[PDB]
Amino acid sequence: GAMGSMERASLIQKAKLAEQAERYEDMAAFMKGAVEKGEELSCEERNLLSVAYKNVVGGQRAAWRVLSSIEQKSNEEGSEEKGPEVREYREKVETELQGVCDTVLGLLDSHLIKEAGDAESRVFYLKMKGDYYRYLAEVATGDDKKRIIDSARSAYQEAMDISKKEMPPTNPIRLGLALNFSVFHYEIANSPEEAISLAKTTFDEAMADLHTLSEDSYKDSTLIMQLLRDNLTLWT
């Protein structure tokens, strides 16, 4: 890769600079280079990796949705033929999004996940794996769509099993995992009841564990609990 000649520490420093500059494509390339150095990632380094790619794919997903909406209106009854351009350009963005998801999944598979032994790292990477298969599932339509969905489900499920055994109910990674798995249930798996049950149980068990936390940990946990509550308000 093009980052093979840069020091690991310099890649990390520049990823932090790119975040300050809101240059998320650069940030993702720097963190990909840092991963490819082959050493495990620290807690802060895992966050940098996640933030970088979440922003990149987030822009791609927002663009894909704009274009998919235009395409669907064009294929309505009474619409004028505009030619192949809207489909072509949606496919363009879709292919670029899939390429980014494949890149992240490749980093997790080679070899972040197999070297991650602590609950905090292993759950973090498995949550990421579920998320990026979820993003692939959002655009999937072919022979493999069901397999993509099950790959997301399987990664989320393994992360959940570990987090329930190894982490307190208020752990922010455990909470964010449950939040995203509930969104998977609602948006991808057509299981809104499973989504609601998971969000409620996650919220109630975190509520009952708040008394054990410092003021700073309380702030971290209650922030994500409010996202669970926001979804429950939208879903019920």
Partner: peptide, 9 residues
């Protein structure tokens, strides 16, 4: 339905 925004830090 919101996932972890996860866009900062």
């Amino acid at each position: 339905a919101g996932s972890i925004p996860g866009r900062r830090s």
